Design an enzyme around this catalytic site. Structure first.
Site, PDB file in Angstrom:
ATOM      1  N   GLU A 113       0.868  -0.964  -0.110  1.00  0.00           N
ATOM      2  CA  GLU A 113      -0.200   0.197  -0.653  1.00  0.00           C
ATOM      3  C   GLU A 113       1.040   0.906  -0.316  1.00  0.00           C
ATOM      4  O   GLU A 113       1.103   2.135  -0.733  1.00  0.00           O
ATOM      5  CB  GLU A 113      -0.819  -0.430   1.248  1.00  0.00           C
ATOM      6  CG  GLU A 113      -2.239   0.993   0.806  1.00  0.00           C
ATOM      7  CD  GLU A 113      -2.862  -0.161   0.039  1.00  0.00           C
ATOM      8  OE1 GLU A 113      -3.494   0.615  -0.933  1.00  0.00           O
ATOM      9  OE2 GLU A 113      -3.204  -1.318   0.901  1.00  0.00           O
TER      10      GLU A 113
ATOM     11  N   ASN B 284      -6.823   9.880  -4.886  1.00  0.00           N
ATOM     12  CA  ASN B 284      -8.159   9.381  -5.821  1.00  0.00           C
ATOM     13  C   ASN B 284      -8.514  10.038  -6.585  1.00  0.00           C
ATOM     14  O   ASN B 284      -8.686  11.519  -6.660  1.00  0.00           O
ATOM     15  CB  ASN B 284      -8.917   8.113  -5.086  1.00  0.00           C
ATOM     16  CG  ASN B 284      -8.248   7.343  -4.064  1.00  0.00           C
ATOM     17  OD1 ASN B 284      -8.003   7.553  -2.805  1.00  0.00           O
ATOM     18  ND2 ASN B 284      -7.883   6.268  -4.519  1.00  0.00           N
TER      19      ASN B 284
ATOM     20  N   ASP C 277     -13.110  10.757  -6.771  1.00  0.00           N
ATOM     21  CA  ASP C 277     -14.012  11.022  -5.981  1.00  0.00           C
ATOM     22  C   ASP C 277     -13.805  12.313  -5.011  1.00  0.00           C
ATOM     23  O   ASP C 277     -14.333  12.325  -3.904  1.00  0.00           O
ATOM     24  CB  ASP C 277     -14.324   9.071  -4.832  1.00  0.00           C
ATOM     25  CG  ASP C 277     -13.652   9.444  -3.728  1.00  0.00           C
ATOM     26  OD1 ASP C 277     -12.187   9.117  -4.334  1.00  0.00           O
ATOM     27  OD2 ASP C 277     -13.904   8.608  -3.145  1.00  0.00           O
TER      28      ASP C 277
ATOM     29  N   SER D  62     -12.004  12.158  -2.236  1.00  0.00           N
ATOM     30  CA  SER D  62     -11.151  11.504  -1.214  1.00  0.00           C
ATOM     31  C   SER D  62      -9.684  11.432  -1.055  1.00  0.00           C
ATOM     32  O   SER D  62      -9.158  11.727  -2.511  1.00  0.00           O
ATOM     33  CB  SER D  62     -11.244  10.015  -1.024  1.00  0.00           C
ATOM     34  OG  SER D  62     -10.998   9.616  -2.177  1.00  0.00           O
TER      35      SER D  62
ATOM     36  N   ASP E  25      -5.978   8.828   0.134  1.00  0.00           N
ATOM     37  CA  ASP E  25      -5.609   7.970   1.110  1.00  0.00           C
ATOM     38  C   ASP E  25      -4.502   8.544   2.679  1.00  0.00           C
ATOM     39  O   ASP E  25      -3.188   9.066   1.766  1.00  0.00           O
ATOM     40  CB  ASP E  25      -5.116   6.506   0.574  1.00  0.00           C
ATOM     41  CG  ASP E  25      -6.092   6.031   0.071  1.00  0.00           C
ATOM     42  OD1 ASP E  25      -7.547   5.919   0.012  1.00  0.00           O
ATOM     43  OD2 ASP E  25      -5.888   6.493  -1.639  1.00  0.00           O
TER      44      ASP E  25
ATOM     45  N   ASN F 199      -8.408   5.761   4.398  1.00  0.00           N
ATOM     46  CA  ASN F 199      -9.952   6.479   3.075  1.00  0.00           C
ATOM     47  C   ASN F 199     -10.494   7.697   4.210  1.00  0.00           C
ATOM     48  O   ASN F 199     -11.066   7.283   4.683  1.00  0.00           O
ATOM     49  CB  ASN F 199     -10.470   6.777   2.199  1.00  0.00           C
ATOM     50  CG  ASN F 199     -11.099   7.205   1.509  1.00  0.00           C
ATOM     51  OD1 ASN F 199     -11.955   7.869   1.276  1.00  0.00           O
ATOM     52  ND2 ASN F 199     -10.372   6.174  -0.265  1.00  0.00           N
TER      53      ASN F 199
ATOM     54  N   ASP G  98     -15.772  -4.225  10.594  1.00  0.00           N
ATOM     55  CA  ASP G  98     -17.060  -4.197  10.334  1.00  0.00           C
ATOM     56  C   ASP G  98     -17.942  -5.530  10.330  1.00  0.00           C
ATOM     57  O   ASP G  98     -18.844  -6.003  10.130  1.00  0.00           O
ATOM     58  CB  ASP G  98     -17.520  -2.692   9.717  1.00  0.00           C
ATOM     59  CG  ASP G  98     -17.849  -1.847  10.316  1.00  0.00           C
ATOM     60  OD1 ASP G  98     -17.280  -1.581  11.956  1.00  0.00           O
ATOM     61  OD2 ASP G  98     -17.514  -0.266  10.080  1.00  0.00           O
TER      62      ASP G  98
END
EC number: 3.2.1.17
Length: 129
Positions: A35, A46, A48, A50, A52, A59, A101
């Site tokens: 990563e 990115n 959109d 956002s 990182d 994100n 989650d």
């Protein structure tokens, strides 16, 4: 700060990541290796809106608050820049929230792609743990 494979292994282990939610230690060193390159200061931007952040690349639209990312939730209660310091606490802490989650480390595209179903026990071979 840029981690060496074992001091990152030893640090992630300090922070209870070895076997958290059923993923062995090497599963983490691996996601972070692909990563960011053990680069806690890495930033990617990115499409959109956002961005990182850090060693694990969390994100801004779900997980942190950099305030220039719309559709923003703040599930980790963390500014995205706390994710860029040299201590990996904030990032580990926000990593457990993510993984917890319901999708798992599937959350991370690079683990999906280059670590998933591979001998990950080989990113911790050598290290005092």
């Amino acid at each position: 700060k840029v981690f060496g494979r074992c001091e990152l292994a030893a640090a992630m282990k300090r922070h209870g990541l070895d076997n958290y939610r059923g993923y062995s230690l090497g599963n983490w060193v691996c996601a972070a290796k692909f990563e960011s390159n053990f680069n806690t200061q890495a930033t990617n931007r990115n499409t959109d809106g956002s961005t990182d952040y850090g060693i694990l690349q969390i994100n801004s639209r779900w997980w942190c608050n950099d305030g220039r990312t719309p559709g923003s939730r703040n599930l980790c209660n963390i500014p995205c820049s706390a994710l860029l310091s040299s201590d990996i606490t904030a990032s580990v802490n926000c990593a457990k929230k993510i993984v917890s989650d319901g999708n798992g480390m599937n959350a991370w595209v690079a683990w999906r792609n280059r670590c998933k179903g591979t001998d990950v026990q080989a990113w911790i071979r050598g290290c005092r743990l």
